[PDB]
Design an enzyme around this catalytic site. Structure first.
Site, short mmCIF file in Angstrom:
data_model
loop_
_atom_site.label_atom_id
_atom_site.label_comp_id
_atom_site.label_asym_id
_atom_site.label_seq_id
_atom_site.Cartn_x
_atom_site.Cartn_y
_atom_site.Cartn_z
CG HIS A 56 70.67 -29.26 40.63
ND1 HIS A 56 69.87 -28.45 40.16
CD2 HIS A 56 70.13 -29.82 41.90
CE1 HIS A 56 68.95 -27.87 41.75
NE2 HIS A 56 69.47 -29.39 42.59
N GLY A 83 62.86 -23.05 42.83
CA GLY A 83 63.66 -22.19 43.53
C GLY A 83 64.49 -22.52 45.23
CB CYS A 109 67.20 -26.43 44.88
SG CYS A 109 66.43 -26.35 43.34
#
Lengths: 306, 306
Positions: free
Chosen positions: B41, B143, B145
């Site tokens: 994503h 941030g 991820c």
């Protein structure tokens, strides 16, 4: 979101963790440039720890006695020096992995990261606070002496702690990297009383702001109190007395949350007096005091390094 | 002595942490050999997260779109592949700092260390457990991820977690490094039901053994109960049911302390029914279940890696 006890990234420090053996006692050392720093009781045995004369004991030591290992690179120790309780071993080769480093003495209530090592090998990293009685509640087995505590800012690694010994009480004591002890402790294995420990109030408020940022808000009352009136309740429960400097450094969290520092103090008054009523805060039934205002800001804003 | 929640030393993993940007959406990635692993994503916007067609969106993406950063090194992304919810990027350069590494899928109740990064830079490491409902309670801001979880055995780094998204509920979900989610979660930003969470019973016993190893002994009763009689009590208080494999893995802690596992279970039963009565265990008023038996053994004997 979410809020865990966070430790600094430990890579920069692993590259400096060596093993130092002198006889049958082997502990860790810190290898920066062409020097290896370790606790001076590496030159003692179990039986030497009762009343060591470190000056005379070092004088009987020869460089060949100091077996310094880096992974399993053997380092030709070429000198020995006594700076307070710290033994600086000059060596043949500079550590190619030497980071940008400072040697800093910290204050009670400030937190640092500890890289736990046994036989020169790192095993774990964890965050801990220098208690107001200058002890640390740590994870140190026998042979994790010489393990260091550090902070990280930008590209620079700030070395502040070296471990020396476990106290009878089960708590740990150590020095700065110039070898000066934190607190009234010495490198002998004798009965050594620590101070009455107190709870780091300013850390507790900062942890309460962290909980407001992460959703847990049940402890907010619509009260407020004076700073001098808050301290009356603080003494009673053995909390450190709040100062205006402590209020000032809480400013930025008070800004993000819209809760005046005194308002947050008024909730802590409620908490010390009434307990938690079976509830938790960030999944803990006790009040946490191992987060500085600075730590929470770095975790609720994402402060990085490099 | 002392017993803290410890994280693996993070050096091996810091050296693979990159920044990956695709438009205005930027997250962390893992650079092992000439491939960079990041959550797919990254190819989404905020508005793409509701019902993404990841196949069609990737097809619309070109290597010129993928801005990969390693420190200050810009990496030629030369290919894109979709393995489940993970997007594998070819790059020009193999990582010179590539560790010995494994790709491991773990089981609920097992614990790992997480290196938290923002904009490709590491910021913190902490120990955490994969809950029985396959969520983690973590420290992940926006941030974080692409931040990974790992274990370390000997010289090998065992990669088991990549974080993908925060649920509405405030907890985090992620995948193994082949990209299959842990638990029933998906990489859409939609209402997502977590499982009913349970307390990892065998972890709680191992933490109780840890407490006896460190002196805290008040909770030891001279009672005992059967495994099936303990489990009846487990259900009521939402504990995972203890299995014989769980008893077997407590064997070594049972040996070091001389308290039979059923004896420890009988202490825990009493603990669930009556509470702690204002006492603590290792300085905590709640029962901890974020330590495996293996973790306690590694801290009560000093297991290293190097």
């Amino acid at each position: 979101s979410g809020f865990r006890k966070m430790a600094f990234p430990s890579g920069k420090v692993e590259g400096c963790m060596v093993q130092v053996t002198c006889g049958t006692t082997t502990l860790n050392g810190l290898w920066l440039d062409d020097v290896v720093y370790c606790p001076r009781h590496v030159i003692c045995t179990s039986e030497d720890m009762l009343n060591p004369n470190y000056e005379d004991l070092l004088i009987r030591k020869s460089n060949h006695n100091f077996l310094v290992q880096a992974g399993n690179v053997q380092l030709r120790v070429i000198g020995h020096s006594m700076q307070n309780c710290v033994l600086k071993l000059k060596v043949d080769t500079a550590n190619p992995k030497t980071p940008k480093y400072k040697f800093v003495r910290i204050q009670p209530g400030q937190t640092f990261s500890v890289l736990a090592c046994y036989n020169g090998s790192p095993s774990g990293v964890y965050q801990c606070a220098m208690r107001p009685n200058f002890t640390i509640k740590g994870s140190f087995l026998n042979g994790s002496c010489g393990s260091v505590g550090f902070n990280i800012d930008y590209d620079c690694v700030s070395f502040c702690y070296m471990h020396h010994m476990e106290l009878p009480t089960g708590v740990h004591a150590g020095t700065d990297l110039e070898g000066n002890f934190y607190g009234p402790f010495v490198d002998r294995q004798i009965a050594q009383a620590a101070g009455t420990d107190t709870t780091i109030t300013v850390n507790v408020l900062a942890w309460l702001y962290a909980a407001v940022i992460n959703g847990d808000r049940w402890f907010l009352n619509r009260f407020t109190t004076t700073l001098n009136d808050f301290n009356l309740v603080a003494m009673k429960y053995n909390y450190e007395p709040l100062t205006q400097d402590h209020v000032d450094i809480l400013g930025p969290l008070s800004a993000q949350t819209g809760i005046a520092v005194l308002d947050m103090c008024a909730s802590l008054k409620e908490l010390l007096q009434n307990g938690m009523n079976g509830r938790t805060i960030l999944g803990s039934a006790l009040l946490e005091d191992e987060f500085t205002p600075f730590d929470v800001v770095r975790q609720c804003s994402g402060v990085t390094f490099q």
